[PDB]
Amino acid sequence: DEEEDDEFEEVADDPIVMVAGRPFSYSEVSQRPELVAQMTPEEKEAYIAMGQRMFEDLFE
Length: 60
Fold this sequence. Notes:
- It contains three helices and two strands; from the N terminus they run ββααα.
- The chain has helices spanning 26-31, 33-38, 41-54; strands at residues 16-19, 22-25.
- A two-stranded antiparallel ribbon has the order 1-2.
- The chain is elongated.
């Protein structure tokens, strides 16, 4: 009758963000807005780009 192929999971390692030309954690960046200001223009995009990638499949 019904399919039992429905499973819910949420496990994954946090991605790495480049701040001022150095490796950093996306979570650490949000905690420190000053880091974003230190990030170059192109580096700033990589910060925002990652966000969209994670929000590619999130419908409520």
